[PDB]
Amino acid sequence: VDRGLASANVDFAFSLYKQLVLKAPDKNVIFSPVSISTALAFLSLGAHNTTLTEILKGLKFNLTETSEAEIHQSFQHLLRTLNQSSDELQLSMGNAMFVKEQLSLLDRFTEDAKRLYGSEAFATDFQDSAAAKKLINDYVKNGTRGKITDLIKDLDSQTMMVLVNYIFFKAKWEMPFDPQDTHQSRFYLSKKKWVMVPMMSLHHLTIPYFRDEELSCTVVQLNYTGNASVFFILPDQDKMEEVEAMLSRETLARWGDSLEFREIGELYLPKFSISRDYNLNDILLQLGIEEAFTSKADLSGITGARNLAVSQVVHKAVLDVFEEGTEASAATAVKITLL
Amino acid sequence: RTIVRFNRPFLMIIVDHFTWSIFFMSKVTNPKQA
């Protein structure tokens, strides 16, 4: 395990989560933290000076204990690990850059992009925005096996570069649900309001379990075949906001360390599909990533000159939970214009 | 004699054993939400 990378990426996940819920407190949340971390790490490869340090600190790296080169190597090793072949679980993460043909790129940037982030450089004619949009969306659709289809909604005709990350995940439960045991049941939006959903069930299950009485919530870990699992956190009625305010790397570690095996008589879990798309601009600024969007942007590591600036970071994610397993995908795009 | 019933908002955190990556993080406030 890369302890340093995992600590930054987990801090970043929960910091991003809190900002998303602050922005839209009544909405479903679904996103891929590791997709966004990797896309922004990829962006920082070309960043200099305050633009660079804001990105790395915004990603929750402690720059007094790590360096940019170590960070990029850590992401290189992460991508290699995630993309290793598996017979049990489908997992893929890719990066790409779409560049205007006439834009002069530093040889060291394109070489580092391929070497560290696995990224090719696709010559893209952004002035034909419809075709450029279709190319990027097709790349993402191919990478997510059809799941993420419209990551790019609008694309400025004067765009110079788009960095893209995608993640694709499909896994079977170690203990799958029997669809004969799925029945329409209430899902309570509030104490007085509910919707009817297909409620899946498992019976006589022994799984890791922890009742967090101080935080008024119950935590269980369900397993996928392969090296992935899922922490489910079930706050008691009306306590979701109280649990969310305690979300952190420390809490997750404590939950992990507190789990004990327990025989569960019945476990009820909805079958559901949810998706969200995000404009991350305001969230990234709240996290301190500011200069990359301004006239003072320093992306001179891409071109040799301070002639590029981020216009928009977007993210889209989908989560499907059903009797056989889970399918989830997400993609992140960093749109970049002239400066 | 223990029942765990996800019939109200809950969180889902999909994690990798190898890297400790959080692949996906989710709050399900409404499975049938627009």
Ligand SMILES: C[C@]12CCC(=O)C=C1CC[C@@H]1[C@@H]2[C@@H](O)C[C@]2(C=O)[C@@H](C(=O)CO)CC[C@@H]12
């Ligand atoms: C929370 C945890 C540590 C803190 C951190 O930065 C990120 C994570 C997420 C993945 C977590 C780890 C850690 O608890 C060990 C695990 C869970 O408890 C493993 C076990 O189930 C124990 O054998 C499988 C999944 C692991």
